[PDB]
Design a protein around this ligand. Structure first.
Ligand SMILES: O=C(O)CCc1cccc(O)c1O
Ligand SMILES: O=C(O)CCc1cccc(O)c1O
Ligand SMILES: O=C(O)CCc1cccc(O)c1O
Ligand SMILES: O=C(O)CCc1cccc(O)c1O
Ligand SMILES: O=C(O)CCc1cccc(O)c1O
Ligand SMILES: O=C(O)CCc1cccc(O)c1O
Ligand SMILES: [Fe+2]
Ligand SMILES: [Fe+2]
Ligand SMILES: [Fe+2]
Ligand SMILES: [Fe+2]
Ligand SMILES: [Fe+2]
Ligand SMILES: [Fe+2]
Lengths: 314, 314, 314, 314, 314, 314
């Protein structure tokens, strides 16, 4: 049993809005060091937990968890576009095993994914089509949302399935740490906005995409001007969460509720559920130890950047 | 705290293919007696569990369980076409409660339902828009499928939520008994039928609907000629299942697996999961007793007709 | 959920060797009263546990338990000869359920049965082809033999399966109470005797059957002259066994071993295992009460005659 | 106490149908290395678990487990023929102990065996009459079939008995990995085929044997042409099963059912039950360590070749 | 299950030494009433627990418990002399069952009993040869002695055996209440009395018997003159013991030790162990209630007279 | 605390009937090596468990266990005769402690013992009066017999008492392995034989002793001619028993019953109970390890010779 884990924040505003050059150099160095460690590990399988940003999943059918037997990246915000290499038979076996373990898992054969899925693959693996990948979508924007306990159990089931494959497995978490970007909501929407939310938004014209990107960039700039326009960053909770993950106290997160998390840190903080899943997976491989802890509140981007790694000790 | 339950088989081939007049009169009398009992009960809320037949849910996103905040009937096979009356606030509260209870439940705001949802409402309530209804979708045709234990806990969570509303609740199960009609499969499909299965089946033209209905009718006639063209009916297992449901021994169904059920009775027998859910729900209201048991193997229709009712003992 | 049980000793020496006319009249009256009670009960299914006397099973393959999907009577010792009516689908379902329950059960599609199966059917039901029957063979002559605990678990599994059929079930036990008649053994056999024991004895010529019957009759007459030629009868143990069965203390028989039983009462006493199975079966139907207890040591026949009945107090 | 274990796939199509010379040399080298390790171990007793292919056991009496006190190999598919050296007293003691342990075990004194029993003895020991052997037949072709839990407990009981003999014991599992060759069935049989299935097929004339062998060879050639004529091989499940066996997680196989295994891998995959039994046996001797893992999907033969070994560490 | 119990003090000094006529009439009336109740009960079997007074058991072999398969009365102190009717087969079955239950029981085929056995049979049944009897000897004079817990277990085992005989059983306890008459001891013995104690006391000449009886009578007269020549009577402890027996609190006697009992009440008080056994036996038959309590300290005899009865509640 | 244990088979036919000289030399060498180890240990106390052969205990009183406060060897079959050195105070303390521990132990002050007691003392210690000895008689010829569990508890109680004496204790088991010599029985006896069995056989005349010895010698010679005149030897069960004793798995013998042991190995095999007791005793002293295992089936003597030793690892 050999396993590697790396959790990293993703940000669509790379190049569009930039911090000081020293911060960018430090972030790039951290990412390069993580990539070097991953390349040294030389994985054979990748399991990628990621959220969506109203690009592939809508309110026509909104599942808490989804597994992508076939996935294609649409290439938004400058990210790569194209079809992902997914082993069909292995994915179907994983779906059967997780369904049998007691997890109600949705299955998709044509899953459109966005920068949340594509960016970690480019940054850490070098491309989309390097290593076979199992994509797992976790809902984080549309209420009701899954809890910490169900996410932990999903991660444990996936890790228990993957521990019997006699392969070197790399686990990835793509969610952010703490931020509150302007995200469309169903309750306060208008007619056109409701129509876009209830599906029919997969084939968005380029003009609407440009308008959405411009709105996100402008909101980010206003956040740089002042953090009270959105929910302000919470470094204390981010550090507590990372420390809890490293100390092997993941189960202590079962006491935190969804509304409590939203009040403390913000509505988008739920992306961190991906991280939780990843860590649960590695707990199935035996004893492990962490490394490469990095955190920094970057106001130029909306989120607070974080990165962590773990390795199974054999 | 008052509760009623009625589980009844649904058959699209009512009038298209007919058995002898005597059995038709007997079935109509049983249905009329059940309708009279329901009208005497005078429910205030309806919770309906029903499957789909590749008309509203496809392989783009296939969840095990779904809740319909908004549902519209498509009027296939001569069934009623119209929009179902769903209380939005109650549906959202139910979704939140079931998610918190530990069930991974999908949510849809524009859910297209087939004759499986429409026919019981016409037959027992008298129309689509008589009583407010909470539509619950359970997958029964696309593998992997949910098990008996997860369906039982879904029913228990829904019943636990509804027991606190201070209303008279009627529970319905629309699934049929053991049968095996021709159903398209993803593995053995061709290009066109793979394309229809993955999606684009919501906007199905009328010519394809006519061809599908004609093929179903022809297969039913061949089944009447000989039962070996499909999986033959299994009265023994149907009677065992009904007896287990009546005796309050629902948990004994947790030992039966999906492949075992498919081998014993047929692939479509999984529709009976709806029945299980319904019974679990009534178990949350306290003591109950059953009545109106009826079963008969009708070869003219593909399925074996069944009907059962239960009432809480206040 | 209704059940009846009747256990009765069988004796091939009816008419060949006879006791006084008074005791014969008493036995016939007891049998007639039991038949009247059974006819009043009006059963729908019969589960018959009976042993074999080296007539259908041999040392080519000797199982501890066997289920007969197809059975045919050979008409030995003046008993009826013919084919038993066995429901094939019900028998196969029973075999599947008992196998799944954790009992290693053998199945046979062509089972030859001696007077042990035929005589109770004639005496209690009126004929071989009156009611559908499930024949269950329990080994009692060829070591190693099954214990009391495994026989009890087999009976419990069969009763648990049959309690969900929504029928009226009659359970029968056909073994004797206490005796040790001359039975061929493998250890002390000669060449021809060994050849007959290891199979090849199914199609026995009539001359060998006549010689066997004459030897049994002569041994019975010598036993009438003196009981020390064989193992003497043990009324105390027979009464203890019957009392234990009536008081619902069947599990107390798990402490008794096979060699202890053989030493106390005789090698053939193991036939009573059938009785145990029958009683275990009725324990699956709920509360029951016993009746019709009769015991008498008849030295003219080899065994000690006994009879008992039980009814579910619905 | 010291013990050795070796599980190896068997294939009647050795020489009749051949793959490339390189893979044949590789398989021969693996077999030779296993034989060398066994010869170095120098065992004193062999316990051989094996299936049958409708040559020794039929539907006259079909047990789930059988122990051969006397066994003779018939010599089919070019395998060796003749009497097997079985210690009678040791076999009878083993039967008594296993019966007392709570396993319903059949006993045979003239057991006709086939290439499934003979081929491993020739390949790994050098001949049929080298070391005393206890043959254990496990049913794998005729439904209903024993489960994984019952097979595990049978192996545990046999190992517990053999751990007190003060001998060096070698355990063998002759079953193959996932495959599905054409095998006659009872449900779809004709009159002559049913007559052959319900016994009377022990003394098959050479013409019928030639026809059966030719049909098997032709089916193998068609499978080489295309794998969809039968159930295609499943390397994923084979590797999962081997990894589960090596990691000491045999109990996890109790959750898998018979119909689930048949659907996932094929009807003949049940032969792997023999492997399970073998491993359970070694768990009775204390701590053990595995070695010699080899797997390769050979399409030229029907099965997927596998081999594994284990040793008690002292 | 029908059971009766009667415990009564025995005294060899009836007629030899007499109290006032009124108390003699009262004792005779109590005994007559108990005899009338026993005759009304009409028992079928008698189990008699009685002690010995160095007349049948000596230091050659001294067991704590003994069962008499054959017993003969010697007729001392004017008691009846003769052979007791003991069912041999029933006694042997009882011995086997009690030994299997976990009690280390001795057996004797020629047991010489004394007035302790004979007197209750004459007084309560009318003679020695009226009803079949199972004689059980409990040691009470030779140290080391059995405790209360082992005596209770012996009584429970005997009652559990006798509850399956389908007979009406009468239990008797012949031990007396608190007293301490002159009893020879091994430690303080001289040569001749050491020789008599170890053995040769069975064929005791009549002159030694006369001397022993005269010594007992003289000691009784001196005790009448003053109670300090022996251990004085303890009415308080006798009443506590009887109250504990009636209230079903027999287990509370497990805390009392042998030396504590000897110090509190006297060395001969250990005879009451018989009473304990009797009561334990009736606890095996179900619910029971006591009656006929009588106690009186008679100084003219050495012991303190007591009598108690119990009846099962059918 | 320090403890030694040695169990050795005894045989009265030493010199009267002899095997080959090599076998005799090997047996003498094994015995001499055991004697040397015992002499090196230098014990201070000996506890000797032994059976009787109808020489000291008869059916007048037959206890399951007996402790000899005073013992005398009668000198049969050429063994030594005379008084044994027994510490009276220590023996009485042991009797009190064992009685208090919950074992129903008989006590004798004049115990006549035979070659079963005398021969191990001569062979292993050098004489009868070398070391103080506690003799414990265990019944093994007269039914009913004590079981394995009660014998184990007796051994544990004795070891627990002796572990507090601050001495070096040697434990001996004088019983023999599987065999069945001609032994008089009560059931099949005649008038004179019954009279001798029910006592009166202590002071046997020399002529009857000569006749008994001659009959035993003749039966041994016939057994040498053929082993079927008695029960044939069972090396398999003997080796299993020795292996179970060495592996510390003594409690596994609680499942074996008396009749099962008699059927498997023979009536006299019950002598091995002594061995069990011895081993139980050493388990009270802490951790121990075994040595000096020797077994050989000697047909010239009736029994199968065995020898084993163990020491406490301080
Ligand atoms: O694609 C979109 O709609 C924007 C999503 C988005 C916005 C701000 C910060 C983020 O980290 C982020 O993922
Ligand atoms: O609507 C469809 O697509 C056909 C569904 C369907 C087909 C056959 C038998 C049925 O009972 C059934 O519901
Ligand atoms: O049927 C046979 O083959 C003879 C068996 C048999 C022999 C003796 C006494 C019996 O009661 C009995 O059934
Ligand atoms: O011996 C027979 O009857 C054929 C059995 C058989 C057939 C195909 C592939 C196999 O691996 C196999 O064992
Ligand atoms: O029977 C004998 O040998 C004398 C026994 C004895 C002595 C004194 C008081 C008694 O109550 C008693 O029973
Ligand atoms: O001592 C006696 O009276 C004979 C006992 C005896 C007889 C045969 C074989 C033995 O091993 C044995 O101990
Ligand atoms: Fe994000
Ligand atoms: Fe349907
Ligand atoms: Fe019989
Ligand atoms: Fe095979
Ligand atoms: Fe007394
Ligand atoms: Fe002996």
């Amino acid at each position: 049993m050999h396993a590697y884990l790396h959790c990293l924040s993703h940000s669509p505003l790379v190049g569009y809005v930039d911090p000081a050059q020293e911060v960018l150099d430090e972030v790039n160095g951290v990412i390069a060091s993580a990539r070097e460690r991953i390349a040294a590990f030389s994985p054979e399988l990748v399991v990628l937990f990621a959220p969506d940003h109203y690009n592939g999943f809508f309110y026509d059918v909104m599942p808490p968890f989804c597994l992508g037997v076939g996935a294609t990246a649409i290439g938004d915000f400058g990210s790569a576009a194209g079809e992902l290499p997914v082993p069909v038979e292995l994915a179907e076996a994983c779906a059967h095993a997780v369904m049998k373990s007691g997890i109600d898992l949705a299955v998709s054969y044509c899953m459109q994914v966005d920068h949340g899925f594509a960016q970690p693959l480019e940054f850490l693996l070098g491309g989309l089509d390097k290593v076979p990948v199992l994509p797992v979508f976790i809902n984080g924007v549309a209420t009701p949302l899954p809890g910490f306990q169900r996410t932990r159990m999903l991660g444990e089931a996936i890790g228990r399935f993957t521990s019997t494959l006699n392969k070197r497995v790399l686990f990835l978490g793509s969610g952010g740490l703490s931020h509150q970007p302007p995200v469309p909501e169903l309750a306060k929407a208008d007619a056109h906005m409701r129509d876009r939310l209830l599906g029919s938004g997969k084939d968005l014209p380029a003009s609407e995409r440009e308008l959405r990107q411009q709105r996100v960039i402008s909101a980010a700039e206003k956040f740089v001007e002042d953090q009270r326009t959105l929910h302000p960053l919470n470094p204390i909770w981010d550090n507590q969460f990372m420390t809890l993950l490293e100390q092997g106290r993941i189960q202590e997160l079962d006491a935190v509720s969804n509304e409590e998390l939203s009040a403390i840190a913000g509505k988008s903080t739920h992306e961190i559920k991906t991280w939780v899943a990843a860590f649960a997976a590695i707990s199935a491989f035996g004893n492990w130890r962490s490394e490469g802890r990095y955190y920094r509140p970057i106001p130029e981007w909306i989120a607070g950047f974080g990165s962590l790694s773990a390795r199974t000790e054999n």
